[PDB]
Amino acid sequence: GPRSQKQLELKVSELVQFLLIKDQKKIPIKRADILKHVIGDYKDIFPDLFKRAAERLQYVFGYKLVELEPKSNTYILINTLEPVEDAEMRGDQGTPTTGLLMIVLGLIFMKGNTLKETEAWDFLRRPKKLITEDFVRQRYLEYRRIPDYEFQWGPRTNLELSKMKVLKFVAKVHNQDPKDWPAQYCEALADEENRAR
Amino acid sequence: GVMTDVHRRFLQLLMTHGVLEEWDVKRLQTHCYKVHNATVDKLEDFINNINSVLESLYIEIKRGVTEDDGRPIYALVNLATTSISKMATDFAENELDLFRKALELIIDSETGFASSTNILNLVDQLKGKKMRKKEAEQVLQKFVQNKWLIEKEGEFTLHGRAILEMEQYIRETYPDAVKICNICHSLLIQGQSCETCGIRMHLPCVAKYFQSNAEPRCPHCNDYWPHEIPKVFDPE
Ligand SMILES: [Zn+2]
Ligand SMILES: [Zn+2]
């Protein structure tokens, strides 16, 4: 019937939302799913709605709507922005160790700024003895045996890292935010604010 | 409207996250600017600029205040009313109905909270694919993860993002069960109520209305306010 400009704009808005909420799980999107779950009876003007959705998905959100395979009627949003930041694994990565280090540094912060060598060893391989030996020589850790091997962060870490960034790490390790762990978080604020003066 | 790449990356990350506290979007704004190095405009000007570009899509970056302590939050919100589709697209049919059942319990609740045991009893009622309590316990935590629900003491309430997203839907669907604040006239899930009359207030609203007042009185019946007066939210 008589569809206004707003009706059409609300229509392409449903379409761009549909593609966004779906793509975030790498779906990929099917035309049949599109025609069924958002288009409806606006199928008579579908190619125009689709095109307007594509440019709005591009100009506003910076995604390129691409048919991943020719003649497949299936689409994918491709990020047309700057590469960095879910980014660089598909290309550029830091030394594996730095990853290993981050867990150990994180694991220490988790247990309460302290941990015994044998525990983390049961964690690690799942050169655990050698890497955690020169990490102390690099002053990334501390290898004290004073009342076992008792672990702490050592001097270097504080200059290259903060407990908040570690907390940002342990959050992103499997999804979370620091806030989830206010036990850990609360002292990070006492550190983040302390980093000022 | 004038739309640069720092605005697009801002919108991209504002959707990966469900909702952000004001200090975290200012952190996000500066973040996007440092990956493209000009003057960082005021957060208000930055947001108002984007919303004028989103007008043709009838969505906006909408400011909201939480109902527990009143901190400012920001989420990408539909101007429309049938905004149930944002979760309807993201979840399954049974997970959907589970949220609806949970929503019904939270609204009808006095505290604005519904226990897990009360929600898990409606599992057999769920439309779509058959699920069980073990699975339903996971879905509720997923709602917490995606900032649709907030859990306290084994009880669930609506996240501030949820209220921002579908306040329009909630009111039009449950007009007899919904609660509105006497001060801001907006949707109320949790809050304080007078014991003389029956009006209710958002915790941050009673905080500002009774601010610095040595004898808090209910604006409707002028009776002494029975409950504790919180202190207004200050970013420090
Ligand atoms: Zn209010
Ligand atoms: Zn009263």
Author numbering:
A (entry chain D): 78 to 162, 164 to 204, 219 to 239, 245 to 294
B (entry chain C): 9 to 44, 47 to 246
Article sentences:
All MAGE family members contain a shared core MAGE homology domain (MHD) which is a ~ 200 amino acid long domain, which is well conserved across the entire MAGE family (individual human MHD’s share more than 40% sequence identity). The MHD domain structure consists of two highly modified winged helix WH domains WH1 and WH2 in a tandem arrangement linked by an extended β-hairpin. The biochemical basis for this activity appears to be exerted through binding to and modulating the activities of RING domain containing E3 ubiquitin ligases. Rather, each MAGE protein appears to recognize a unique region on its RING partner, suggesting that MAGE proteins are able to function as a versatile and adaptable protein interaction module.
We have noted while examining the MAGE-G1 NSE-1 complex structure that the linker region connecting WH1 and WH2 was absent from the model and the electron density in this region was poor. As the missing residues lie close to a crystallographic 2-fold symmetry axis, the termini of the various domains are positioned such that there are two alternative ways to connect them. To investigate which of these two possibilities is correct, and in the absence of other experimental information, we have downloaded the structure factors and performed a re-refinement of the structure, testing if the data support the alternative connectivity. Our re-refined model has slightly improved refinement and geometry statistics, and we were able to correct a number of minor model building errors in the original coordinates. Electron density maps covering the connecting region, (calculated omitting contributions from residues in the linker region) show significant positive density features generally supporting the alternative connection, although we were unable to completely connect the two domains in this way with 2 residues (163 and 164) being absent from the re-refined model. Importantly for the biological interpretation of the interaction between MAGE-G1 and NSE-1 (and MAGE RING interfaces in general), the re-refined interface between NSE-1 and MAGE-G1 contains contributions from both the N and C-terminal WH domains. In the new interface the N-terminal WH domain of NSE-1 is sandwiched between the two WH domains of MAGE-G1 with additional contacts coming from residues in the linker region and the C-terminal WH domain WHB, some of which involve residues in the second WH domain of NSE-1. Analysis of the interface by the PISA software identified an additional 385 Å2 of interface area (1385 Å2 total), 11 additional hydrogen bonds and 7 additional salt bridges. Support for this interpretation comes from the fact that the in vitro protein-protein interaction data found that both the N and C terminal WH domains of MAGE-G1 were required for NSE-1 binding.
